[PDB]
Amino acid sequence: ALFKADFEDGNIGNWRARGTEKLEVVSGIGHNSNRSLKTSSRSETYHGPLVEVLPYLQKGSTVHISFWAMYDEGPATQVINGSLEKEFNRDTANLEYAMFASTTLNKGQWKKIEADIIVPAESTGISGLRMYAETPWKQSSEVTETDTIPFYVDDVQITAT
Ligand SMILES: O[C@@H]1[C@@H](O)[C@H](O[C@@H]2CO[C@@H](O[C@@H]3CO[C@@H](O[C@@H]4CO[C@@H](O)[C@H](O)[C@H]4O)[C@H](O)[C@H]3O)[C@H](O)[C@H]2O)OC[C@H]1O
Ligand SMILES: [Ca+2]
């Protein structure tokens, strides 16, 4: 148990948007609970809730990340991805991204996204590693309504292996 977010305290914490989207801890919508993190006002596939997690982890280790996600408007099914944003040498202009997991969700039902991930070693110069959720990438030219639907995440956990 290295990191846990259940949002039951109502606090956004260090969770942030990636662009112009809106994040809000809502009540009355949750995974077997009353609170969760809603992301809305998405206008890119890459808009989604993100949190910095490097400080919780040991560089050079393997950890297990999971979370639950739900959407309740738009298409009948939609893919949601779990991804990592990585910063090296404190160079904010040259960020990297990787999908670590993907599942197809049915409208209105909660489902788990999970995978092992590798935390790069110290000698890489890694300086940020942030987990986030999104829909499949993208492209601004081609982004649609179904791609940018609002969605909920809950019960985010990272664990040792
Ligand atoms: O292996 C490939 C993967 O690397 C790739 O991952 C996608 C890479 O693009 C990601 O979208 C990025 C997200 O960051 C945006 O920058 C923001 C916009 O400017 C400011 O508002 C803000 O400060 C920045 O954070 C960037 O514009 C956008 O392109 C996407 O989420 C990843 O899924 O996927 C394809 C694989 O082949
Ligand atoms: Ca919750």
Curated annotation (Swiss-Prot):
Residues 1-161 form the CBM-cenC domain. It comes from the Bacteria. Coiled coil: none annotated. Consists of three different domains. The central region of the enzyme is the catalytic domain. The N-terminal region contains cenC-type cellulose-binding domains and seems to act as a thermostabilizing domain: a derivative lacking this region shows a lower optimum temperature for activity (35 degrees Celsius) than the full-length enzyme, and a reduced thermal stability that results in a complete inactivation of the enzyme after 2 hours incubation at 55 degrees Celsius. The C-terminal region contains family 9 carbohydrate-binding modules. Belongs to the glycosyl hydrolase 10 (cellulase F) family. Endoxylanase with high hydrolytic activity on birchwood and oat spelt xylan. Xylotetraose, xylotriose, xylobiose and xylose are the main products from birchwood xylan hydrolysis. Shows increasing activity on xylo-oligosaccharides of increasing length. Displays very low hydrolytic activity on Avicel, carboxymethylcellulose (CMC) and p-nitrophenyl-beta-xylopyranoside. Also shows transxylosidase activity, allowing the formation of xylo-oligosaccharides of higher degree of polymerization than the starting substrate. This is Endo-1,4-beta-xylanase C. The gene is xynC. The chain holds residues 199 to 359 of 1086 of the full protein.
